UniProtKB/TrEMBL annotation, chain B:
Keywords: DNA-binding, Phosphoprotein, Transcription, Transcription regulation. It comes from the Bacteria. Residues 1-63 form the HTH luxR-type domain. One of its GO terms (molecular function) is DNA binding. The chain holds residues 161 to 228 of 228 of the full protein. One of its GO terms (biological process) is regulation of DNA-templated transcription. This is Response regulator. The gene is degU. It comes from Listeria monocytogenes. Signal peptide: none annotated.
Amino acid sequence: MPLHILTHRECEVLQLLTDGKSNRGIGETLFISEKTVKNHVSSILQKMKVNDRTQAVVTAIKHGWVYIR
Amino acid sequence: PLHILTHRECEVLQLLTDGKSNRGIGETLFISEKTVKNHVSSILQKMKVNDRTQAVVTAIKHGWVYIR
């Protein structure tokens, strides 16, 4: 399950990243600061045991946790 | 516009979709990281995106690369 390992906010960040949004775009969409976006990304890399956004995103797509809009 | 990427740029893009680092890509393709970094920089320029994640997600969307 995604929610066994991620929060809902983290799932939303991952989907917004899969959509192609930047840290600025994600914060705009979620009304959070860019630093906070990076904090969510930092947590996602920890929980998924990957080293950057791209591995996390490609892994989320691979497991069906997010979709290509 | 797939025609604008070189085959080598496509290989780097596929290796990025696989999850390899610039060190892994340089290892796999027997090139230096500086050469890999330039290929990445070139791919973002030709694709008109700002970072690796947008390039990879855009290539997946259009079927240029596959999830191994």
